[PDB]
Amino acid sequence: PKLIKNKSGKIFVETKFSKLIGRPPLLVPGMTPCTVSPDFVAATTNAGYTIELAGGGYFSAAGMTAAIDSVVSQIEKGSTFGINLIYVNPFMLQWGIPLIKELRSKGYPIQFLTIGAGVPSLEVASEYIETLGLKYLGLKPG
Amino acid sequence: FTKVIDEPIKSIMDGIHDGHIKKLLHQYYGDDESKIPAVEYFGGESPVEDSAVFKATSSTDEESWFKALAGSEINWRHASFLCSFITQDKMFVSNPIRKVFKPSQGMVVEISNGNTSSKTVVTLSEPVQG
Numbered sequence: 001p002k003l004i005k006n007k008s009g010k011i012f013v014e015t016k017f018s019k020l021i022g023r024p025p026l027l028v029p030g031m032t033p034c035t036v037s038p039d040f041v042a043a044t045t046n047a048g049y050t051i052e053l054a055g056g057g058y059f060s061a062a063g064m065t066a067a068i069d070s071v072v073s074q075i076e077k078g079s080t081f082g083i084n085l086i087y088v089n090p091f092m093l094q095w096g097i098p099l100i101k102e103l104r105s106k107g108y109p110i111q112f113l114t115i116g117a118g119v120p121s122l123e124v125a126s127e128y129i130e131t132l133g134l135k136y137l138g139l140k141p142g
Numbered sequence: 143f144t145k146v147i148d149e150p151i152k153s154i155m156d157g158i159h160d161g162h163i164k165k166l167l168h169q170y171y172g173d174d175e176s177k178i179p180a181v182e183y184f185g186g187e188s189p190v191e192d193s194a195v196f197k198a199t200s201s202t203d204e205e206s207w208f209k210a211l212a213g214s215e216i217n218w219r220h221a222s223f224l225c226s227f228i229t230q231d232k233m234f235v236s237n238p239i240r241k242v243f244k245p246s247q248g249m250v251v252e253i254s255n256g257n258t259s260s261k262t263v264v265t266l267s268e269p270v271q272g
Contacts, residue, residue, distance in 0.1 A: 001162075001166055001170075002166075002170075002179075003163060003166055003167060003170075003171060003178040003179075004178065004179055004180075004181060004184055005175075005178050005179070005180050005181075005184075006180070006181060006182065006183055006184045007180070007181075007182050007183070010184075011163050011175070011178060012184050013159060013162045013163060013166065014184075016189045018184070018185075019184075019185070019187040019189070020185070020186075020187060020188065020189055021185060022183070022184050022185015022186060023185070024155065024158075024159040024162075026155055026158055026159055028151075028155075040151070043151050043152075044151050044155070047150075047151050047152035047155055047156070048152075048155070049151070049155040072232050075232070077229060077231060077232050078229045078232075079232075080234070106233070107230065107233030107234050107235045108233065108234075109232055109233065109234050135226075
């Protein structure tokens with residue numbers, strides 16, 4: 001681990017992670033229900049930390065779209081956030097992955113996707129890496 | 143460790159980061175903030191000469207081309223050529239500077255004042271009617 005500072009004199013812990021995202025290497029993972037709230041996702045993003053919006057709190061693309069739009073309205077221009085989807089909830093994936101693809105194609109500030117509660121197959125992971133327009137992919141091996 | 147109710151998320155996350163900074167500063171930088179290296183901006187790093195001229199060919203490597211145009215120093219020109227995305231209000235779109243300077247046969251990029259960021263000029267020249 002290293003220290004680095006920017007022009008403004010802000011010090012960062014410098015790791016492989018912090019060097020990618022330009023923020024402290026500290027994240028609030030997706031939690032149903034704690035990070036389903038757009039207000040908490042926005043507060044943490046505005047604090048300068050990476051947080052996953054929990055898909056576990058959402059049942060359709062429309063409901064998750066309204067939550068994402070609420071986060072985007074409350075975060076500063078140039079801020080980003082991630083989405084946590086649950087791999088053992090095939091229904092969530094079925095509306096969740098097309099939604100992220102579509103919002104990323106519209107340029108929504110979704111930096112990454114974390115898949116909780118299972119690791120996708122090589123074929124599925126390839127689809128997520130190549131099609132979703134994400135900076136990185138979060139995996140949570142058990 | 144969950145003891146203090148209604149601590150702002152900023153105080154919790156900052157408290158952890160500032161704790162790490164303090165401990166690294168003591169252990170690895172002799173309690174001296176002046177030994178911390180500075181960069182213009184921190185981020186955008188994938189985990190994997192004053193006057194110059196670059197000529198694109200059919201076989202020119204895209205990553206090597208953009209590294210060369212970017213330069214070594216972290217400044218506006220590094221961001222211009224290596225950021226995959228730029229911001230349009232709150233949206234994140236593909237870096238248009240990378241699209242425009244995508245290398246192809248006939249493209250000639252002259253960098254002038256490459257060492258002084260404030261004065262650097264990157265000039266793309268292409269064949270126009272011969």
